[PDB]
Amino acid sequence: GKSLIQQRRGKGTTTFRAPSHRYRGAVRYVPLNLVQERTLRGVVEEILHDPGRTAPVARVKFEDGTKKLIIAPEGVLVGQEIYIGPEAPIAIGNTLPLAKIPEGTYVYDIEGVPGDGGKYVRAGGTYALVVSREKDKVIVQLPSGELKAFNPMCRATIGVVAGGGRLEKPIVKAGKAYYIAKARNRFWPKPRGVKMNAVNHPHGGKEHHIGRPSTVSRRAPPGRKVGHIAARRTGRR
């Protein structure tokens, strides 16, 4: 038989790669063999649009003369002064360890293990809620529902991610979607296996129907996992 788009993506061709040369750099915090307790102070100088982030970025100049990119919170001004460390104040744009952060605070850009650089709640519009503070773990509510546990030395940022309310206005045409998907080269347009041929898909035929249940096992081999994968249920409710 023939292959799937699933299967050709895994090789890394220009038809599937990300055009990262078009983007602004990566967004990490600072390495913490440098941030023992010193509570760096910095100044925002620019706010900019990144084609790979679904969120604005902000350029910061520190007292070291070093320049970094952060993810911009909602309501940060060009000219402000943000602090990064354990004893910094509690405001919008300031990065602290979760232990020092009360219960009820909104939070973004959380590290998984202390030192990573920021793994959670970095998409535009998103936030997390602090629930509890033990001596061995902090519980946090993520934008999906999960109540995850983090070690209390992990770092987060206070406030909300800008860019919110992005999916309210419709995409009206197909050329606009062309441009949105050409920015980051997503596969667009999309075909349907039901209207493909039998070499090219587990569905596929002269009749444009599926002749087997769309539910597939988590132990089905590659080339066959198409549809609903390990579906607990289906339907409307």
Partner RNA sequence: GGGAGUAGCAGCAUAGCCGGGUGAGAAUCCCGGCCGCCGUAGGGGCCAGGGUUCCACGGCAAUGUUCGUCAGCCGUGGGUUAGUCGGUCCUAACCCGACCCGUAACUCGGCGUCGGGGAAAGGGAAACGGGUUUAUAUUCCCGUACCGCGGUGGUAGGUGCGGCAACGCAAGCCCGAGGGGUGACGCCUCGGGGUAGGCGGACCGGUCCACAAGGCCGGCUAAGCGUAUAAGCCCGGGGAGUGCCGUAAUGGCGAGAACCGGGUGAAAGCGCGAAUGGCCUCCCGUAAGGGGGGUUCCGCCGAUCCCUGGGGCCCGUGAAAAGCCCCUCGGGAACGAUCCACCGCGACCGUACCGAGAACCGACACUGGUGCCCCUGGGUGAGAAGCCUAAGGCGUGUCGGGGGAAACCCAGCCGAGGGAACUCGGCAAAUUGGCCCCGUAACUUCGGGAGAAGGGGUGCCUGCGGGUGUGUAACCCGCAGGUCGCAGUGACUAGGGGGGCCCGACUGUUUAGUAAAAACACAGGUCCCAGCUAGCCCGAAAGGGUUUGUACUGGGGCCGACGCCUGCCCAGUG
* Residues engaged in binding another protein (CB under 8 A): 47, 49, 55-56, 58, 72-78, 90-92, 102, 104-106, 124-125, 127, 158-160, 162-166, 168-170, 172-173
Identify which of 126, 160, 170 has the alpha carbon closest to the alpha carbon of residue 144: 126
**Count of CB atoms situated within 10 Å of the CB of 128:** 20
- Residues present in the chain in total: 237
Q: Beta strand 81-84 with 40-48: parallel, antiparallel or unpaired?
A: antiparallel
Contact of residue 1 among another protein, RNA, none (CB under 5-8 Å per partner type): none
- Joined tokens for residue 195: 């209207």
The least CB distance from residue 4 to RNA, in Å, is 6
For 182, half-sphere exposure in the C-beta direction (CA atoms, 13 angstrom radius) is: 6
Token look-up 């620019």 returns: 46
Contact of residue 78 among RNA, another protein, none (CB under 5-8 Å per partner type): another protein
Nearer to another protein, 31 or 165 (CB): 165
Contact of residue 225 among another protein, RNA, none (CB under 5-8 Å per partner type): RNA
Under 8 Å between Cβ of 62 and 70: no
For 169, half-sphere exposure in the C-beta direction (CA atoms, 13 angstrom radius) is: 7
- Joined tokens for residue 131: 């629930």
Contact of residue 90 among RNA, another protein, none (CB under 5-8 Å per partner type): another protein
Nearer to RNA, 48 or 91 (CB): 48
Token look-up 């982030």 returns: 53
Give the whole-angstrom CA distance, residue 66 versus residue 77.
Answer: 20
Nearer to another protein, 4 or 71 (CB): 71
The least CB distance from residue 159 to another protein, in Å, is 6
Nearer to RNA, 54 or 80 (CB): 54
The least CB distance from residue 190 to another protein, in Å, is 21
The least CB distance from residue 31 to RNA, in Å, is 15
Contact of residue 131 among RNA, another protein, none (CB under 5-8 Å per partner type): none
The least CB distance from residue 74 to another protein, in Å, is 4
Give the whole-angstrom CA distance, residue 65 versus residue 27.
Answer: 18
